Each structure stands twice: as C-alpha cells, then as structure tokens.
Amino acid sequence: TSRQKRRAEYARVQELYKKCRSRAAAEVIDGACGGVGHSLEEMETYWRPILERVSDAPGPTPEALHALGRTQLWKPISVEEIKASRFDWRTSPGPDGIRSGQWRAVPVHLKAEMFNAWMARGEIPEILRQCRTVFVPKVERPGGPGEYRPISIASIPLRHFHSILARRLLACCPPDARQRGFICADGTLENSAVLDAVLGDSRKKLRECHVAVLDFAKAFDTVSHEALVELLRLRGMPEQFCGYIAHLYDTASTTLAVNNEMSSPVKVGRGVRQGDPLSPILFNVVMDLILASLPERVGYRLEMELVSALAYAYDLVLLAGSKVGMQESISAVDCVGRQMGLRLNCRKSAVLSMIPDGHRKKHHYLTERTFNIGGKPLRQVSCVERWRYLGVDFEASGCVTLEHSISSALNNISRAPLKPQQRLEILRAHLIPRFQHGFVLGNISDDRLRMLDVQIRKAVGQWLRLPADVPKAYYHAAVQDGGLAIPSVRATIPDLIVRRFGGLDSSPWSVARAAAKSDKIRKKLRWAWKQLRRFSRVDSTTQRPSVRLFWREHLHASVDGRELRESTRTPTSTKWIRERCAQITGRDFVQFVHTHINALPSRIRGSRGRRGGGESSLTCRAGCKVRETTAHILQQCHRTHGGRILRHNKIVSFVAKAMEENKWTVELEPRLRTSVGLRKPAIIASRDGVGVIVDVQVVSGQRSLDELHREKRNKYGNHGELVELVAGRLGLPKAECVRATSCTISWRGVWSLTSYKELRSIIGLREPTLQIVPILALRGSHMNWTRFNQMTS
RNA sequence: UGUACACGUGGUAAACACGUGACAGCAGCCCCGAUGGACGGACCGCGAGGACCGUCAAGCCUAGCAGGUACCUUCGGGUGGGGCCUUGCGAUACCUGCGGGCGAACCCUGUGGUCGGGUUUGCAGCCCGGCCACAUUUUCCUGUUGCAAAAAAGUCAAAUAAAGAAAAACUGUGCGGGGUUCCGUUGGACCUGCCAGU
Ligand SMILES: [Zn+2]
Numbered sequence A: 001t002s003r004q005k006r007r008a009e010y011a012r013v014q015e016l017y018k019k020c021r022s023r024a025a026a027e028v029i030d031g032a033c034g035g036v037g038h039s040l041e042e043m044e045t046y047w048r049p050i051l052e053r054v055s056d057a058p059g060p061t062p063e064a065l066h067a068l069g070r071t072q073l074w075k076p077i078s079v080e081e082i083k084a085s086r087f088d089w090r091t092s093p094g095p096d097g098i099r100s101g102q103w104r105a106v107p108v109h110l111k112a113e114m115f116n117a118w119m120a121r122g123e124i125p126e127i128l129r130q131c132r133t134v135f136v137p138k139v140e141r142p143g144g145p146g147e148y149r150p151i152s153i154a155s156i157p158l159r160h161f162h163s164i165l166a167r168r169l170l171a172c173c174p175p176d177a178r179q180r181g182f183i184c185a186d187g188t189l190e191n192s193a194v195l196d197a198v199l200g201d202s203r204k205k206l207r208e209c210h211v212a213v214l215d216f217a218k219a220f221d222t223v224s225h226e227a228l229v230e231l232l233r234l235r236g237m238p239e240q241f242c243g244y245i246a247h248l249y250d251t252a253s254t255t256l257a258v259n260n261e262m263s264s265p266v267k268v269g270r271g272v273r274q275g276d277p278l279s280p281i282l283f284n285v286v287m288d289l290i291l292a293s294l295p296e297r298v299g300y301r302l303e304m305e306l307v308s309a310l311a312y313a314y315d316l317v318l319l320a321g322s323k324v325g326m327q328e329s330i331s332a333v334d335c336v337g338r339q340m341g342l343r344l345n346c347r348k349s350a351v352l353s354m355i356p357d358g359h360r361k362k363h364h365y366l367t368e369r370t371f372n373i374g375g376k377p378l379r380q381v382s383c384v385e386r387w388r389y390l391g392v393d394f395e396a397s398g399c400v401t402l403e404h405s406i407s408s409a410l411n412n413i414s415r416a417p418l419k420p421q422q423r424l425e426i427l428r429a430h431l432i433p434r435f436q437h438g439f440v441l442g443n444i445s446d447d448r449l450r451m452l453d454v455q456i457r458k459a460v461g462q463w464l465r466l467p468a469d470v471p472k473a474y475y476h477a478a479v480q481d482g483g484l485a486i487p488s489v490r491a492t493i494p495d496l497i498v499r500r501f502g503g504l505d506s507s508p509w510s511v512a513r514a515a516a517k518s519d520k521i522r523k524k525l526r527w528a529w530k531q532l533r534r535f536s537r538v539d540s541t542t543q544r545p546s547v548r549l550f551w552r553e554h555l556h557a558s559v560d561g562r563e564l565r566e567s568t569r570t571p572t573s574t575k576w577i578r579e580r581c582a583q584i585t586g587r588d589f590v591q592f593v594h595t596h597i598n599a600l601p602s603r604i605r606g607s608r609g610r611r612g613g614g615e616s617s618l619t620c621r622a623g624c625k626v627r628e629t630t631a632h633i634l635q636q637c638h639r640t641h642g643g644r645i646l647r648h649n650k651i652v653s654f655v656a657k658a659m660e661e662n663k664w665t666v667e668l669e670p671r672l673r674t675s676v677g678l679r680k681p682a683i684i685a686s687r688d689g690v691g692v693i694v695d696v697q698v699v700s701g702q703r704s705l706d707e708l709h710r711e712k713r714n715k716y717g718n719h720g721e722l723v724e725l726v727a728g729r730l731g732l733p734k735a736e737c738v739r740a741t742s743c744t745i746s747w748r749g750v751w752s753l754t755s756y757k758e759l760r761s762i763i764g765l766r767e768p769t770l771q772i773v774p775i776l777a778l779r780g781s782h783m784n785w786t787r788f789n790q791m792t793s
Numbered sequence B: 001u002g003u004a005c006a007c008g009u010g011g012u013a014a015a016c017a018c019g020u021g022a023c024a025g026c027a028g029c030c031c032c033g034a035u036g037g038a039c040g041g042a043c044c045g046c047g048a049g050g051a052c053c054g055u056c057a058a059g060c061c062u063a064g065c066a067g068g069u070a071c072c073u074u075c076g077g078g079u080g081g082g083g084c085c086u087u088g089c090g091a092u093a094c095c096u097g098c099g100g101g102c103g104a105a106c107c108c109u110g111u112g113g114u115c116g117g118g119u120u121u122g123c124a125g126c127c128c129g130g131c132c133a134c135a136u137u138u139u140c141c142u143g144u145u146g147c148a149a150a151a152a153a154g155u156c157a158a159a160u161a162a163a164g165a166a167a168a169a170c171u172g173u174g175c176g177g178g179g180u181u182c183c184g185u186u187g188g189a190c191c192u193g194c195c196a197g198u
Helices: A002-019 A021-030 A062-068 A080-084 A101-105 A108-121 A156-172 A191-204 A225-234 A239-250 A279-292 A323-340 A406-415 A420-440 A446-464 A489-501 A510-516 A520-534 A547-556 A562-566 A586-596 A630-635 A638-661 A705-717 A722-730 A753-762 A767-790
Strands: A132-137 A148-153 A209-215 A300-302 A305-307 A315-320 A350-356 A665-668 A683-687 A690-699 A739-746
Touching: A002 A021, A021 A406, A021 A420, A062 A279, A080 A108, A080 A156, A101 A156, A108 A156, A156 A279, A191 A209, A191 A300, A191 A315, A191 A510, A191 A520, A209 A323, A225 A239, A225 A279, A225 A323, A279 A323, A300 A510, A305 A510, A315 A323, A406 A420, A406 A446, A420 A446, A420 A489, A420 A586, A446 A489, A446 A586, A489 A520, A489 A547, A547 A562, A586 A767, A630 A638, A630 A767, A638 A665, A638 A683, A638 A690, A638 A739, A638 A767, A683 A722, A690 A705, A690 A722, A690 A767, A705 A739, A705 A753, A739 A753, A739 A767, A753 A767
Parallel strands: A690 A739
Antiparallel strands: A132 A148, A209 A315, A209 A350, A300 A305, A665 A683, A683 A690
C-alpha cells in the first residue's frame, strides 16, 4: 500500500538523517524521496541487460602511447599509514553486514596483515567483494525504468583498502597542472576565473574565441575493463597491480535491492564503479591520457599564456581561437573516447563561438550548429548561462538557468518527509554552499542575487508558516545572535569573490597568475569589495569585514527583534535553534519560532497599517481596555494568570530536579510571615552551612534583563529579616552565608547574563540543564497564548 | 570628459606654460517585490491607499533573467518609485524569448495525423505537454487509490466498482490505566476519576 511505502520511506530518511547528515541531505535535495514505484517487474528487465555489456574498445594505440609519452607502489602496508588515511566513517553498511563496529574493533595490526595477505594472494573474498545497488529516481515523478539511477555501495573493508591505494597513487604520480578537477585544493577555484578572463579579453581586443563545454556522462558506465587494464600496464605501473585490478573487475557482481526484494547477482561489463575511492583517481589517468592526446599548437593566447583545456570535476572545457583549431581537438577527444569506450552526451554538451568582425568594432555571436562530435551536431548557445561546473546539481544543457533548478531543489526539500527544523538545517548547510560556486562564472548583477534571496526567504516562510511582515534579518542573522542563520547569497557571493580572487595572484598555477593581471577580474574584485563593504560591518577585534555583525545590527534595531538584543551575550539562550533540535517535536518548533520573533497574531501585531477602525481592534479582548500587545497577552492578563503560574511552576520543578541531582536539600515554597507583609520565595536550598534563596522569574525584555534581575536580587537579599528567617530554618548561624539568587528568563527564551553567571557559579549545574530552560519558557509562553485564544466568552 | 593634487621639464619669482602620474581618489547614503487591464458609475477621511457594480478579447504587470536594434557618451558603460540631506564628475526608447503572479481557455477516456521534449539504443520503445473526430438524469451506503502526522480522525457522491438500493476548573518531581510525537529506562502535550483547598 502507498501508506506503507510512505511509512517506510519516512522511517528510512529519519534513520539516515540521524546517522549521517550529509548523505541524507544530498539524497533529499536531488529528489530521492519518492522511492521506487516500478517494483521488480519491468525494472530488472531494463537495468540488467544494460549492465553485462562489455565495450568493444580497441584500447590505446601507438599514437596515444606516444602522446602520453610527451615505481614505489605495492609497498608493504605498515600500521602508521592506516591511520594516516583520512576516512569518513559515517557511511552505509555493506551487504556483508559489517556497518562500522566489527571493523572499528579489530586492531590496526590485524587489518594491516589482512591487506598484506590480500595483495600477496591478489584475491578479494567474494563475500567482501559483493556489493549492492539501490535505485534513485531523477525527476520527482518517475515514469519509466530508464529515469532512475543505479547507485552502488560496496563493502567498508574494500573502501578502506582502496582509499590507501588512491592516496598512494595521488602521492606517487600527481596529475598534470591543467587537471584542476580531482585535486588537493578546491577544484573550481581558478577555472572560474580563467574562463572569465578569457571572455573579457576576447571582448576587449576583439579576438576570435571559441570555448566548448562537453561533459563526461556515463563515464562511470563506459570505461572498458581491458582498455583500462592495458592503459595501466603501459603507464609504467607494476604489471601485477594491473593484473589485480583486472581480477577485481573481471570477477564482479551486483545485487538488485528494490523494495527490500532480493535479486540474483548480475554481471557488469563496464568498469569504474560509482563511490569507490579508486574510481576518481583511475579516471584521472584517463584524463591525463586525453589531455596528452590534444594537438600541440592550439588554444587561446591569454597574455603570452596558452590556455586550451580546464578539466572540471566531470567536464572538459576546451578552448580555441580558430574555428578549424577546435575541430581537430574534438576529433582527437572522440577517437580517444571511442578507443577507450567513453561516451559523450551530445545533448548535454555545448559550444560557445565568438567571431569578431572588422570595420564595425562590435562582436558577433554565431547561432547555427557548425562543430560536431563524430557527426552528431553540437548545440550553439549564445549567452554563457551554463555555469554548472559545480559537480552535483546536474546540468540541463542550456535549457534553463541556475534558477528553475534551485526551485526544483526547494520543492524536493519541501515535499520530503522532514520536520520543519530538518529542512531548515538541510537548506542551511547543504543547499546554499552547493550552488554558490555557480553564481561566479560570468557577469553577475545585484538584482539576481536579491531575487534568489527573496525566493529562498519565501520558501523558508512557507516551511515555518511565518507571516509576510517579519524582519528579513531574522533569516540571515547568526544563531548566537538569535535567528535561523540562513546564509544569504546576496552577501556571500561578494564575500566568496573577495576571499578567493584576491589570492589569485598567489596561486602556484602559471595560468591563474596570468589571469590575475586582467581587466575583468579586477573590475569584478572592485565590485565585490564594494558590495561586501555595503553589506558588512568592520570587526572591532580584527578590523576585518564580517556579515554577521551587519545582520545583527539590523536585527536588534528592528521592532519585532529588539527584545532579542540580549541573546548575543549568553550563547545558551539560542541553543535550541540549531544544535538542540532533535529533542523538539515538529509543530513545537514552528510554535517556538512564532513566539520567538513575536509572529503570533495579536490585535496590535496582526493589524499593522490597518488600524483605521475603532478601539475594539486595539483594546484587549479580555476587557482590560488596554493596548492588546503580545506582551500584554503573555504577561499581564487575568485570563492568562493560571497559565502564568503553570509555566512558573513548570520551571521551578525542573530547576529543583537539577539541584537535587546536584545533591542539595531543596524546599518548595517556603512559608515565612514577615512583619512588613507577605513574602513568597520560590525555593531554598542549603549545603554544608551555606544556603541560597532561588526565585524564578519570567519577565519581558524591553528593559535590560540584568536590572530586572537586580530588582528582586536586592529585595530578597537585603530585606533584613527574611535572610535571618531562612538562616534559622535551614540551620546556618551566620546570616551572611545565605544570599539571594534569581533565575530571570525573558518570555522569548533569553537568559539573563548576571542571573546565568550566578546560577552557574553559586551552584554546580552542567550545561544541558541550562540549555532546556529556554525550551520551557517558550513552551509555557505559547501554551499561555493558546490558553488565551482557546475561548473568547 | 569635467573638478581638485604629486612629480618632472623650462624659468629670477608667480595668480606662467606643458607633459607624465597611487587599479590615483573625487559619478552620497537609506527604504520598497504587492499584481490582471481598458472604457461607464456608485464608496471612503471624495486626500497618499483600500470595496463593489457593467461589457471586451485575451492578454496584464515585473528595480527578475538572456539576446539583438537605435542613441548618449568617454574609453568604464548606461534606462523603477520614494526619503534624508549634502555638493558629492554619468548616461534612454522599444520590440524577441524564459521565469514569477494575475487573467483566460482546457477538461471523464482510447485510438491515429501530429508537433515540440526527456530516456536507452540506432527512429524500436516508456513517459510530459498542444490542435484535429468517436463514445438518460437526480437520490444513501460497503470495498480500491491522492495529501493530513501513527494502526485514526478528515476527505458524507476527490475519482470510483451487474457498484447494493430509491425518484424521474486548577493547583500538582501526586496517584491508575493504552503501539503512540519522535527520546535514546525519561521527558511537554491532550483522555478519565480520586487526593488538601479555592
Ligand atoms: Zn488583557
């Protein structure tokens, strides 16, 4: 039943989110939320035949070997290198069964000797060799088995054993400097700047330019086993290493796990499997070969520097100044791919041509299709809007911009079965830092960034049901200052440009340094600096611009968020927005956010600009005949009095729990009849001759919290008779040992600095206890609001 | 291009001349993203803004994106509204396509002519949309599927099935009971009755 699959999908996504956040977020963003809908039938019959298809690649030719031509490996594995390899352990279990524990428990020497024996024999056990493959729909509405994706997961020991081999390959034989894809530094670091400099130069000096982008799709599904084995054999690497790779690939199998249904193993006829740590290094050797097969004298002369190819993660951006120049380059790429089995998406590859014309001083754009990939024509795109050289969030071949693909991601996140805080976190730390690279490879304006920010804010407002008139700084202000900390692409793009392009001239690359001394790059740097200065405030400590201070300055100066200005001094106050979100339910988070920025609809806040009516729209609905502000509702209203005592006692119970856990003799509601009047302390506790009178207060924040704390600190500790009475009751002789103490929390859930410091210092409570008091304050306040709004008489 | 300043040349000095110059600076800050129009009237404090009533055929808005046309320039480039000032060298007219929201059609389904699309392969399939033609009405109660948060409340005819028929209060480290908030033996929420009181 559909409800059953929805149940299973929700459980699976929640478990994945609890275990590993990054993989779950990356799966949710792409669209892996609907699961499989075609079952085993008409699914194995489509994907099984496409797997055991050995490519008839002839292999590299003497010409390719000579173009390539233009020892410490297999060393015994020691125990230091095992921990020298950086491994991400928050991954999925293999089909064998060992998830992380049976592999973590074994000592290092045993694993080292096991790998040594494995390479001595050269045979990975079939049980450990076995791997599974789950299916992922591409478009949000699957229509056929060809619209899915076979993500394959291998065993943990095999991934660990290959990671050290990949590290050895990277250290022993580093790639060419042109290869800036799978590199130690950031891949698309200088490649974005080089293309921009080339485009600026070709427009400036009216130089003939043609830049083509062609991607390596099915590059996982097109490398022939024999071709790669021969390539590694002729590279000079040990022949037995190649034999081991050939034995690994020739003896391979795959299990189809669709709807938890077992399936027989299936042969694979094409090499390079997805997710293996050796795959992006082995494919780097193919990149080295294809780059070495490029024609020698061809490219674009950018300031005495010749630029021809800038390899991206899985792309190949070729450049040429002459129309005939790139045709032979493309033919060479085609023959290299065909001789190795690689296939190219003519649909997803594009060519940008730029032909100048004299006697007019303008520059002309070609429109018709001229170049081709072995006969198949290449589409010609006018504007450079295919800045999708960012890896994930795959391309659309110039059909759409970067938007209309961000909105798809937002819809995929919105429809996924996640709590309102989980979507917020996924957008915070997995979507914004993912497409932000794409908005720098070309000319950009402020309006595009502002519209992207507005769309993101609209999506977040829909997720958390906030009204329209909420301070826009609330979304982008940092957590410690009070806010959702949604990073804003309006100010983080100039920040990225300034931070990266500023250090362009310090890059080891010779091409990047040439690109640094350009005209367009410097103009963009000036624009980015201007925007950053306009959207930041200089830091007092370090004299360096920061956007967080600017967002805080706007937020604390607003009307809704003025009461939050005291939250930046005690980071515990806003510990529930981001860190402690797994302990708070779904609707609870939305209610807490609503009362946190005072988005609750009152007769004052909910009628902004629409107060042309009578006093009934402004007078308190309880008959208090005063202004109906949310502070009045939540703090001073006779209908809300019972809820106020309820919340107060809810807090005093939890703090009493804490001090009891800290081994203090507590006394609830002491009864002291002073001669002056009636004094009602909250709770007293004494230990080893010293006592304290701890009273609990939840008060508004429109005044300073510390002063309000002092107003009862002095009253309870300087009465002159009450301290003697509590000293006599507790059993301590000297009245100066006992002194008053308060726990003052603003009803939005903001600690008081003096109160928090006193409570931490006078009596020992660990951080988790103080973390939960804002939760109690917010819950009590919103329950008070619901109690008030439940009836209207 | 237009202001102001650094050096050099020449000169007895200049309120004299020229050239070269920090990416030379000097071309201020702040706020604003709502949405259908033409013609005729009733509303409003007839005031900035917000209601409604009549037709029209489809388009109407956009400081959103991309490309070209002309013009101003100065080479860098340039086209929304409002405010505070302050001196504090800038720049407009439209059409084309895409996205957004307001319209408007469209509408129970199967074949074919279709056309734009995606996806494996070499025009063989699956799926997304747009034109051209085909196939009694009202009326209550059991099963199948689309989203709400949980083993159930919403969906009484969303589509349905010789479908089976008819007409034409609360105050609480209180107490008891259950696959239900989401937590890895606890915690807030509602469901009930007693416990000392109002
Ligand atoms: Zn009141």
